[PDB]
Design a protein around this motif. Structure first.
Motif, mmCIF file in Angstrom:
data_model
loop_
_atom_site.group_PDB
_atom_site.id
_atom_site.type_symbol
_atom_site.label_atom_id
_atom_site.label_comp_id
_atom_site.label_asym_id
_atom_site.label_seq_id
_atom_site.Cartn_x
_atom_site.Cartn_y
_atom_site.Cartn_z
ATOM 1 N N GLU A 80 38.545 32.462 40.016
ATOM 2 C CA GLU A 80 38.840 32.537 38.604
ATOM 3 C C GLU A 80 40.302 32.955 38.411
ATOM 4 O O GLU A 80 40.970 32.390 37.570
ATOM 5 C CB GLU A 80 37.900 33.550 37.925
ATOM 6 C CG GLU A 80 37.881 33.498 36.379
ATOM 7 C CD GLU A 80 37.885 32.074 35.773
ATOM 8 O OE1 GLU A 80 37.137 31.171 36.241
ATOM 9 O OE2 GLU A 80 38.642 31.862 34.800
ATOM 10 N N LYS A 83 42.876 30.039 39.138
ATOM 11 C CA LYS A 83 42.826 29.058 38.058
ATOM 12 C C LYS A 83 43.520 29.573 36.781
ATOM 13 O O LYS A 83 44.397 28.918 36.193
ATOM 14 C CB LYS A 83 41.360 28.749 37.850
ATOM 15 C CG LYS A 83 40.997 28.062 36.629
ATOM 16 C CD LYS A 83 39.493 28.130 36.564
ATOM 17 C CE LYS A 83 38.867 26.828 37.017
ATOM 18 N NZ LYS A 83 38.836 25.823 35.904
ATOM 19 N N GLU A 84 43.181 30.791 36.407
ATOM 20 C CA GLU A 84 43.734 31.411 35.236
ATOM 21 C C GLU A 84 45.235 31.624 35.349
ATOM 22 O O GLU A 84 45.972 31.214 34.446
ATOM 23 C CB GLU A 84 43.012 32.734 34.969
ATOM 24 C CG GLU A 84 43.424 33.454 33.717
ATOM 25 C CD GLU A 84 44.748 34.168 33.863
ATOM 26 O OE1 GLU A 84 44.786 35.212 34.565
ATOM 27 O OE2 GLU A 84 45.754 33.684 33.280
ATOM 28 N N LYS A 85 45.702 32.254 36.429
ATOM 29 C CA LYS A 85 47.137 32.505 36.605
ATOM 30 C C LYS A 85 47.945 31.198 36.707
ATOM 31 O O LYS A 85 49.069 31.143 36.199
ATOM 32 C CB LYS A 85 47.438 33.370 37.849
ATOM 33 C CG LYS A 85 46.922 34.818 37.797
ATOM 34 C CD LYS A 85 47.700 35.731 36.852
ATOM 35 C CE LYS A 85 47.126 37.161 36.849
ATOM 36 N NZ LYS A 85 47.681 37.990 35.726
ATOM 37 N N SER A 88 48.273 29.779 33.313
ATOM 38 C CA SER A 88 49.194 30.626 32.561
ATOM 39 C C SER A 88 50.650 30.340 32.914
ATOM 40 O O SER A 88 51.501 30.175 32.044
ATOM 41 C CB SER A 88 48.875 32.075 32.863
ATOM 42 O OG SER A 88 49.447 32.926 31.904
#
Lengths: 92, 92
Positions: A80, A83-85, A88
């Motif tokens: 997670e 994917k998130e970083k 971003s």
């Protein structure tokens, strides 16, 4: 700059470099409401494990179960984060 | 068959399918000459952990250290398997 193929080259190398950087951050998975906490990075290298003293006293089967659950939780959190970083960083 | 783009499509999907299959196999990492054995698959899902009863008795710091070492060993073995099995499957 240096031409299109060179710019393209570089984008690929910088993208790879950012993925490796992201993969250096740590996440701490847990099981048993914190009974076992395990810290790993993006490469899934296990950095530290914190086992509640109370677990050192009973069936080793329960501790094993909690450790496996903590690692799986850390792995899902690490995935997670990657994917998130990335999403971003690629502000677009 | 179906044309070049379709054949190309399929090669990509079948390649992905074979990578996922490979990632379902398990490896068992260990630390302490078998004191801790941890089994994970290619996705790094922890399936089972076997802790030597002797470790349930002393500093929890040592057990934590051995567990982290066992997981890192399993991860390196899992990575080596992905590479080896792929190279093998692509007999060329």
């Amino acid at each position: 700059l240096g031409g299109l193929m060179k710019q393209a080259q570089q984008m690929q190398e910088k993208m790879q470099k950012m993925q490796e950087e992201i993969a250096q951050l740590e996440v701490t998975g847990e099981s048993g409401a914190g009974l076992v906490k395990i810290t790993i990075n993006g490469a899934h290298n296990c950095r530290r494990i914190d086992i509640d003293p109370s677990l050192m006293e009973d069936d080793k089967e329960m501790l094993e179960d909690l450790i496996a659950a903590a690692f799986n939780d850390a792995v899902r959190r690490a995935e997670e984060l990657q994917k998130e970083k990335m999403a971003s960083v690629t502000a677009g």
